[PDB]
Design a protein around this ligand. Structure first.
Ligand SMILES: O=S(=O)(Oc1ccccc1F)[C@@H]1C[C@@H]2O[C@H]1C(c1ccc(O)cc1)=C2c1ccc(O)cc1
Ligand SMILES: O=S(=O)(Oc1ccccc1F)[C@@H]1C[C@@H]2O[C@H]1C(c1ccc(O)cc1)=C2c1ccc(O)cc1
Lengths: 9, 227, 239, 9
């Protein structure tokens, strides 16, 4: 999911 | 860890520096155009919100699963309290963007939106009458993020107590008496109940109108979380 | 004349105004269905509403409002009020919701009705939260009165300021209870915050509950009383 | 309005 990888930075 | 060690002024300054920018809309009309501007705006705000959340003390200490959950639950609340905050100095008007200032009559353009607009405006007027300060606002927004989805559970609660301490610190620093401090604190937090209410209702329309306008992939996934 | 009350007098008035614990019309001769389960909850809520109305009249400052204002506050907060009552009497029953002394249900029994187990889990989590915080009865009646006065106040002026004065009084009362309980000053504003943040979750559960109560009505699962119909038709709407 | 009536009785 998009939200997941946006947080993972 | 480090979030629990921050001082009251360090908490304030950390949240102030973490504040997201005020974005413009594409605005230069109909129900599709109205919803189009709002959704495009919200989608760009969501990107900044995610990076803002990572700068809220104690948030990165949480698992990615919990971080996702909290943002899924609170994203519209966070958008809304941001909206009413910048709309404070504009009575009867909603400042979605510096170039997008709307009154309640322009909210009648979309079916069911004028009801939400009125609730947002009333919230803004309530902030105006309380003379809500910027330092208080950033505390309220962080509380919303951490509370609306809540050793992890205890950590979130420990950070929440710290923000409570921060709010009280701000009020004491403002010269308020002890009795006035509790009262104002209660007043502020009860408004979060109304903000939750507005988000629940707004969400109820959004996964209805979701097919009117092109909703972005991120927005759709946030919408889906409440279904 | 509510603003002339002391803290102890606020507490005593609120404690004495408390509604009774009603029984459900639960019939154990037949198994549970979605309809039969929804029928029990509907019938129970309907009878509780009548007691809620008379309780609301005994809440300090409420009778000072116009009938239109009294109607609005109750229309906005009735399910919240039912829910906080439910989580309160379910505290000493881990993993269960005590709708009535003869109606004690777990989440698996909530699966009998479509979409109810989600609310049941939230209600259970809230009840557990209260149990963990060791919520006192004096604190509970304060919270329930805050919900009545606050939930519909932003959707209204002259007596709008009156409500906020009464709400400030209840705040004073809560702190007083916590101070008398021996909590430090810091602990007092932390606990105040904790209890009030829970009200946001109660609003949330009510909204989600109301949303499904539309659909149950719109699918003709059980007959709703005319009162319950009108309470539901205040929310109601709007998607 | 039933609620209205009940608030009077
Ligand atoms: O008015 S509503 O509740 O939606 C509706 C309710 C009823 C009918 C039609 C609606 F559109 C919603 C809250 C606020 O205005 C809309 C919006 C938004 C958000 C996301 C989205 O996909 C669409 C709209 C907001 C926003 C608030 C703050 C912002 O910074 C940006 C936007
Ligand atoms: O589970 S639900 O949120 O509704 C739903 C119903 C069906 C599917 C999904 C739902 F979410 C609602 C909260 C609590 O259980 C239900 C109920 C009630 C209330 C009124 C009513 O007409 C019917 C039910 C309650 C109650 C709570 C406290 C009480 O003292 C009494 C009842």
């Amino acid at each position: 999911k998009i939200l997941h990888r946006l947080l993972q930075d | 860890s480090l979030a629990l060690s921050l001082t009251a002024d360090q908490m304030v300054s950390a949240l102030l520096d973490a504040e997201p920018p005020i974005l413009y809309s594409e605005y230069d009309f109909s129900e599709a155009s109205m919803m189009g501007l709002l959704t495009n705006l919200a989608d760009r705000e969501l990107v900044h919100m995610i990076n803002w959340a990572k700068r809220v003390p104690g948030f990165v200490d949480l698992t990615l699963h919990d971080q996702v959950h909290l943002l899924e639950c609170a994203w519209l609340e966070i958008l809304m309290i941001g909206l009413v905050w910048r709309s404070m100095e504009h009575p009867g008007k909603l400042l979605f963007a510096p170039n997008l200032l709307l009154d309640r009559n322009q909210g009648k353009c979309v079916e069911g939106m004028v009801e939400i607009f009125d609730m947002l405006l009333a919230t803004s007027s309530r902030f105006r009458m309380m003379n809500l300060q910027g330092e208080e606002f950033v505390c309220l927004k962080s509380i919303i993020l951490l509370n609306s989805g809540v050793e992890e559970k205890d950590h979130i609660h420990r950070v929440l107590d710290k923000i409570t301490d921060t709010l009280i610190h701000l009020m004491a620093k403002a010269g308020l008496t002890l009795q006035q401090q509790h009262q104002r604190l209660a007043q502020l937090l009860l408004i979060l109940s109304h903000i939750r209410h507005m988000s629940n209702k707004g969400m109820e329309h959004l996964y209805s109108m979701k097919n009117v306008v092109p909703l972005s992939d991120l927005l759709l996934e946030m919408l889906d979380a409440h279904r």
